[PDB]
Design an enzyme around this catalytic site. Structure first.
Site, PDB file in Angstrom:
ATOM      1  N   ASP A 472      -2.458 -11.524  -6.254  1.00  0.00           N
ATOM      2  CA  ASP A 472      -1.105 -12.107  -6.235  1.00  0.00           C
ATOM      3  C   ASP A 472      -1.085 -13.597  -5.868  1.00  0.00           C
ATOM      4  O   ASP A 472      -0.410 -14.329  -6.522  1.00  0.00           O
ATOM      5  CB  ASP A 472      -0.213 -11.292  -5.243  1.00  0.00           C
ATOM      6  CG  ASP A 472       0.660 -10.214  -5.959  1.00  0.00           C
ATOM      7  OD1 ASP A 472       0.847 -10.235  -7.188  1.00  0.00           O
ATOM      8  OD2 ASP A 472       1.144  -9.358  -5.155  1.00  0.00           O
TER       9      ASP A 472
HETATM   10  O1  LIG Z   1       2.398  -6.660   3.012  1.00  0.00           O
HETATM   11  C1  LIG Z   1       1.188  -6.843   2.848  1.00  0.00           C
HETATM   12  O2  LIG Z   1       0.399  -7.547   3.467  1.00  0.00           O
HETATM   13  C2  LIG Z   1       0.644  -5.982   1.702  1.00  0.00           C
HETATM   14  O3  LIG Z   1       1.419  -4.788   1.657  1.00  0.00           O
HETATM   15  C3  LIG Z   1       1.028  -3.801   0.640  1.00  0.00           C
HETATM   16  O4  LIG Z   1      -0.285  -3.352   0.866  1.00  0.00           O
HETATM   17  C4  LIG Z   1       0.884  -4.514  -0.753  1.00  0.00           C
HETATM   18  O5  LIG Z   1       0.447  -3.637  -1.791  1.00  0.00           O
HETATM   19  C5  LIG Z   1       0.165  -5.923  -0.798  1.00  0.00           C
HETATM   20  O6  LIG Z   1       0.399  -6.657  -2.043  1.00  0.00           O
HETATM   21  C6  LIG Z   1      -0.513  -6.272  -3.135  1.00  0.00           C
HETATM   22  O7  LIG Z   1      -1.535  -7.254  -3.331  1.00  0.00           O
HETATM   23  C7  LIG Z   1      -2.420  -6.951  -4.414  1.00  0.00           C
HETATM   24  C8  LIG Z   1      -3.516  -8.033  -4.345  1.00  0.00           C
HETATM   25  O8  LIG Z   1      -2.878  -9.378  -4.492  1.00  0.00           O
HETATM   26  C9  LIG Z   1      -1.660  -6.827  -5.696  1.00  0.00           C
HETATM   27  O9  LIG Z   1      -2.572  -6.472  -6.730  1.00  0.00           O
HETATM   28  C10 LIG Z   1      -0.564  -5.749  -5.575  1.00  0.00           C
HETATM   29  O10 LIG Z   1       0.184  -5.559  -6.757  1.00  0.00           O
HETATM   30  C11 LIG Z   1       0.381  -6.105  -4.347  1.00  0.00           C
HETATM   31  O11 LIG Z   1       1.225  -4.947  -4.018  1.00  0.00           O
HETATM   32  C12 LIG Z   1       0.767  -6.745   0.357  1.00  0.00           C
HETATM   33  O12 LIG Z   1      -0.014  -7.929   0.427  1.00  0.00           O
END
Ligand SMILES: O=C(O)[C@H]1O[C@H](O)[C@H](O)[C@@H](O[C@@H]2O[C@H](CO)[C@@H](O)[C@H](O)[C@H]2O)[C@@H]1O
Ligand SMILES: O=C(O)[C@H]1O[C@H](O)[C@H](O)[C@@H](O[C@@H]2O[C@H](CO)[C@@H](O)[C@H](O)[C@H]2O)[C@@H]1O
Ligand SMILES: [Cl-]
Ligand SMILES: [Cl-]
Lengths: 785, 785
Positions: A472
């Protein structure tokens, strides 16, 4: 101590200090709550956007939780103070806020509840939280028992702090009619349009009692006085003062005074939550706040969790793996696809991956998710960055920043759906596009997605990255319109090769040729421009620079281009061993495989914001589990069975005591990451993010079901293709598939050269069970060399 | 106890519990800090937008402070722990976080510093904070003295908690090169444009020591352990562990170990603040962190405050009034206009009113503020909602919501400037407009402002309100484009009558006729549509409803239409007494006059967001001081001397003990409000907002100078026109005016019928001193009946 209890229903931690960040979660159709072992909690609900009812003591940012959330004394939580009226001595359950010496402590994470047992001063306390399926309300059960031989006089005080609700207007008072405390606010705003938007907000917070109390207090400051949370003034006095909050920070405090006989126990119920008005709070009271209400809610909630129990139960020689897989994995998978992480605009790659996991739980949900997602495809073929789940919702946060990878997931994840269900007929369903009047089949939508990915490539044949891909925050590689992604190119080749296989199955032969040729063309372009000699690079910047290469000091290798080059065919048999070795030497750790290494320690502004995260956290080099499982899946795809298993098993903390302590997590969910930057900051490496929201788990469950246990669907039936680790002499699994049950026994035999499969005790030829009758149970014996 | 000390330089409070919300402030060219008596603090700086260096322990909203700010245990603050190494006993200065029993406590608000003296365990502590004029840094001086007869072994621990800096990246470590602790973060964002915007942010926080310490700790959680702030684990041990923060909440903790002889005192210096990098922190260290640095900063800061001391010193029979007026008022006025409340887009009415106050302090600042404000006038004549003070700045928050009153302030406040300075030549200065090529005189800009106000009226001749007027949150009266404001109409008539007087002085006679006729026309329209029989209503809604009338249950009368109907002539001699009585009966309280009553208890959506604030807070019926001083000014304009004085004097808390306790404020500033809704919620009525940002003070200072003491400028000289309360038999003032000094003695005499003025002991005819020589001092005796 830490172990599974109650036949797998719960998992118990017996120290409040050894793993102080540890937690579990519960959810329902409209809300989620993370509960920390010491009593802190974070709860969010949907109305239909996110909101909270228990606030911080300041004006907090709009947010659910941060990775590695810090707690602090006034963080929202769920507490009960006990006072011995004879001695004045006090303690609190579960442990905070007083942090007294306890004689006993248990934190019980449950499939369907969260609970504690504690003891101090000879008084035994039990606390149990659960949620109903469909309403936003916390059901609280408190039990207090005099464990000794003489009568005891106690004051018992729930402390559910409401926090700082609003600078515009906040208050609170006792309501005899509602039977408890009602805190009230007006959510702040300035735009007249927001008044109309905010009209149905649940801006009251209730804390209601089944049993009438002796007194109450609604003013936080009056509750504490100079004694603070450690020794509240209101608890030092004989009776609470029954104060209210008038533009003062409100709180929910009640007091019960009891003389308890030797061995006498008493039960007290409460509900806590948001409401539009007192009428709504009373509606919740009548529905839930009783023994019968709690029982019925618990029965219905257990039925919900059982409905999502999924398709695999295992009995291996590893009892930690068994417990995780059987009791914890399925509910975590089910949460993601059933409620879509409680956002009205799920990120497209999350909506598709989460619903992929549902293929193994409730595949009709998966089927509808594809239909819903494709209805929002753009006329160009491109997919939007998010999928809207409600009329009027908008794309938010990262979904407003242009990322380019959204189409790749469609065939990648549809493959799991088609293999599991055999529902090729989904391909014929007709759905519209986001704009225009065109209604076309799923299959034609999918062709258009893949034509999009082929068209969204530069003169070299590599995929544009714009302001990011799966990563992201990788936002400065292509923000000027020229930069390209290494990962997206190799993933596109995978996607096209899968979709071409589907087209061939559907007799869409011209499409199959077209996509297979596209995949070749991309893989050729990757090998000519991305391959760096020992691994594949990550991308090429707007100014033509290849990064993720051996000339880079930080970000020298990224995991994702390697996994996906294996999957999509860019990595041939000669390159594959280079990949395996580079990953082992630079990315593998005792807590799992890092997603990049060394972690970035300063901004690199032709790669972007990912490089500014703390080294080892999140996308900047953590053991990012979702990247780790893509590698595991790739390893499975080439029969690297031992490596696949070892790296998957690292995702589960324990039983090693040092590992358990260092990660700090209860083994009741897989978190989005364990801290990386293992070479650069060993002290913190392995620490859990504690975040249960992660697309990891749909892939981990797929890897176990199709890969490790090897019980995979095909148009002919059930394919038996296990990759068990060599240490296991025997194992069993029970597989539900297409309406039937398979009781599978696996055994190593030196008497054979090649695997032998027996169905109901007679040998089959080939590796497919093809005659599958709904409701039937089959015995499978799989003998392995 | 509470009293002035050090010849008026400071004001001392001797209990940390009696007035626990009380506070004082300091500022400089780039920052401000509110310091609470217990040790909590809020500090904001400009870079060139607002930011902070000491954060909450959660992810907080972007904000300075709320009215009636609640503090909580982990709120940012400024602390020192003392440990007796022989007994293990601990206490903290100033009082938080330990809240031990003290033998002595003093909180000293200063003109130029803030300090404490405390004692416990026989150890005497002094703490002193000050700021330099031009850099963002806190200068901290700590003194520790063994007050007893034997040597004492102590550990001394500054505790300056940094808080939760960022979810993206936060850390901290000890730096031997910088000589202290450096915490570091990356301010979170997602848009690539914000990376470029944020490049010069001071995202490090330093805490630097002049004297090398024995040890340090940078990890908040390690500092507390299970003992918390009450009894930190790191302080229980012999030596701090010297830990760092790696994506963990950082803190600034040092440890000094000393054996102190009987009566021995030692001094320790520190600086605390934001920095871009370690180099900047070291630059601040070299510049400030020494006895010589602190001395030079203090000398320069005192000179700054003296430069703003203003034009009036008083000696009345009320020693509370004397202290406030002489020592506290001028610096509060000076803060507003010198730094414009530390926003890059001051609300236009605030920019003009605050700089009006500067007419009496540094009128060249006023003069430039008019020039700057008018340069941003729109070609239509309308004034923007805010004034931009920096290239690239934008209008923010309420400044984006269309309000209509911005022009009214121009002649209202310019009158004070012209009367004080006689600078009519300002009217000839040429300035551009916000767009277009037209450059015109001030005077022509002003004509265009008043033509705007006359044009921005409906068919009835009443001023459109759009989404608000002086009352910021009064946003639903006119949001549909038809609603009109009662207050703005009567204020427009005032503005036009003042400006017509100026035009007549400047021989611009056609303009004078035009504006005087406009004022008549508006006043006629007000009397026909707004007057409600006993007072003037507040407005008329988009659907034609008059509110602020006797038929309204809540919001039955508003203060502002009454004050301004007096000023602008809508209220004739027959109506005036009705106004006075209605205000006394419905709005006056012991803490001052409420701005509306009864307060709104629920949304009324043809008036708007003001009605949703808590009843008695802010615009919803508080004793809103700025509205109260407009009434006072109006009372002065009609010679209602006793009423004017009584209501002005209510603005100053004390000396009555119950009053002092109930308001909870140190009498070292006037807050924006004291809580109202006096009839509806008496328990909380009078409580101070504690907010020192308020346009009240420029008007209070004008009222005292021109009205009560009656020493007012005119084109002929100094007009002597006092309205002293009758209780005073004698009084003195010293007035600086146009470069001369007037030593004024006032005395009541029964031997006269009419006031008699003596200049240098000979009687004058008339009431104007007209021969004024720069640098001269004049004796004025004013004898009164
Ligand atoms: O809030 C956070 O730190 C994390 O919460 C959840 O785990 C999310 O899934 C995280 O974001 C995700 O990051 C990946 C890598 O960039 C993306 O592929 C995914 O679609 C996105 O949900 C969030 O950082
Ligand atoms: O932050 C607050 O609560 C207050 O802080 C300072 O006192 C401000 O001056 C307040 O806003 C002011 O409100 C009045 C009444 O609506 C306006 O006339 C004025 O221009 C605006 O600054 C603020 O509410
Ligand atoms: Cl990546
Ligand atoms: Cl008003």
């Amino acid at each position: 101590g830490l172990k599974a209890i109650n036949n797998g229903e719960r998992y118990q931690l017996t120290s409040p200090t050894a793993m102080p960040q540890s937690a579990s979660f519960l959810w329902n159709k409209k809300m989620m709550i993370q509960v920390n072992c010491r009593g802190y909690a974070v709860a969010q609900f949907m109305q239909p956007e996110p909101a909270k009812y228990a606030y911080a003591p300041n004006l907090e940012a709009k947010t659910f939780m941060q990775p590695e959330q810090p707690y602090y004394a006034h963080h929202p939580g769920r507490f009960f103070y006990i006072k011995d009226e004879e001695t004045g001595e006090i303690f609190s359950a579960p442990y905070e806020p007083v942090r007294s010496q306890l004689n006993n402590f248990s934190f019980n994470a449950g499939k369907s509840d969260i609970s504690w047992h504690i003891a101090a001063l000879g008084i035994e306390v039990e606390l149990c939280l659960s949620l109903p399926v469909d309403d936003v309300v916390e059901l609280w059960e408190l039990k207090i028992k005099n464990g000794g031989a003489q009568p005891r006089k106690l004051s018992i005080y729930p402390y559910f702090p409401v926090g700082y609700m609003s600078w515009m207007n906040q208050s609170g008072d006792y309501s005899q009619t509602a039977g408890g405390i009602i805190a009230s606010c007006v959510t702040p705003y300035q735009k007249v349009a927001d008044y109309f938007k905010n009209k149905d907000f649940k801006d009251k917070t209730f804390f209601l009692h089944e049993t009438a109390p002796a007194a109450w207090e609604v003013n936080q400051k009056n509750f504490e006085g100079e004694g603070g949370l450690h020794n509240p003034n209101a608890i030092q006095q004989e009776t609470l003062g029954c104060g209210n909050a008038l533009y003062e920070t409100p709180t929910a405090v009640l007091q019960y005074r009891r003389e308890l006989a030797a061995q006498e126990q008493q039960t007290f119920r409460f509900i806590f939550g948001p409401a539009f008005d007192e009428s709504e709070a009373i509606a919740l009271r009548n529905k839930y706040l009783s023994a019968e209400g709690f029982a019925k809610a618990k029965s219905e909630y257990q039925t919900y969790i059982t409905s999502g129990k999924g398709c695999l139960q295992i009995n291996t020689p590893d009892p930690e793996l068994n417990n995780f897989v059987n009791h914890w994995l399925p509910r975590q998978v089910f949460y993601h696809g059933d409620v879509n992480r409680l956002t009205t605009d799920p990120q497209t790659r999350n909506y598709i991956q989460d619903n992929m996991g549902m293929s193994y739980i409730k595949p009709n949900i998966t089927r509808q998710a594809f239909l819903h997602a494709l209805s929002q495809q753009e006329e160009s073929g491109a997919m939007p960055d998010g999928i809207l789940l409600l009329e009027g919702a908008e794309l938010k946060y990262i979904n407003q920043i242009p990322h380019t990878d959204h189409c790749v997931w469609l065939p990648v994840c549809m493959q799991a759906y088609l293999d599991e269900t055999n529902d090729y007929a989904l391909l014929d369903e007709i759905v519209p596009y986001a704009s225009g009047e065109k209604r076309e089949t799923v299959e034609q939508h999918m062709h258009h997605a893949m034509r999009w990915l082929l068209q969204a490539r530069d003169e070299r044949g590599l995929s544009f990255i714009a302001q990011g891909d799966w990563c992201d925050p990788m936002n400065m590689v292509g923000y000027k319109g020229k930069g390209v992604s290494g990962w997206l190119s190799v993933a596109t080749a995978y996607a096209l090769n899968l979709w071409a296989d589907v087209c061939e199955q559907r007799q869409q032969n011209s499409c199959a040729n077209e996509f297979r040729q596209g995949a070749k063309d991309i893989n050729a372009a990757v090998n000519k421009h991305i391959w760096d000699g020992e691994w594949f690079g990550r991308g090429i910047t707007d100014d033509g620079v290849l990064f993720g290469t051996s000339k880079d000091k930080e970000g020298r290798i990224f995991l994702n281009p390697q996994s996906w080059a294996i999957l999509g065919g860019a990595a041939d048999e000669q390159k594959i061993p280079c990949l395996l070795d580079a990953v082992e030497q630079q990315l593998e750790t005792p807590y799992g495989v890092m997603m990049l290494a060394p972690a970035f320690t300063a901004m690199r502004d032709d790669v972007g914001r990912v490089t500014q995260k703390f080294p080892g956290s999140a996308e900047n080099g953590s053991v990012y589990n979702h990247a780790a499982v893509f590698y595991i899946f790739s390893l499975l795809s080439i029969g690297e069975s031992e490596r696949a298993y070892k790296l998957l098993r690292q995702m589960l903390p324990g039983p090693d005591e040092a590992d358990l302590l260092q990660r700090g997590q209860l083994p009741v969910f897989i978190p989005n990451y364990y801290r990386g930057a293992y070479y650069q900051h060993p002290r913190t490496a392995g620490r859990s993010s504690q975040l249960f929201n992660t697309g990891t788990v749909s892939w981990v469950y797929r890897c176990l079901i199709e890969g490790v246990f090897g019980l995979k669907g095909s148009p002919q039936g059930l394919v038996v293709q296990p990759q068990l680790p060599v240490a296991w002499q025997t194992a069993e699994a029970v597989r539900e598939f297409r309406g039937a049950t398979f009781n599978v026994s696996y055994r190593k035999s030196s008497d054979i050269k090649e695997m032998e499969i027996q169905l109901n005790e007679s040998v089959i030829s080939g590796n497919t069970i093809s005659d599958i009758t709904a409701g039937a149970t089959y015995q499978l014996t799989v003998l392995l060399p």
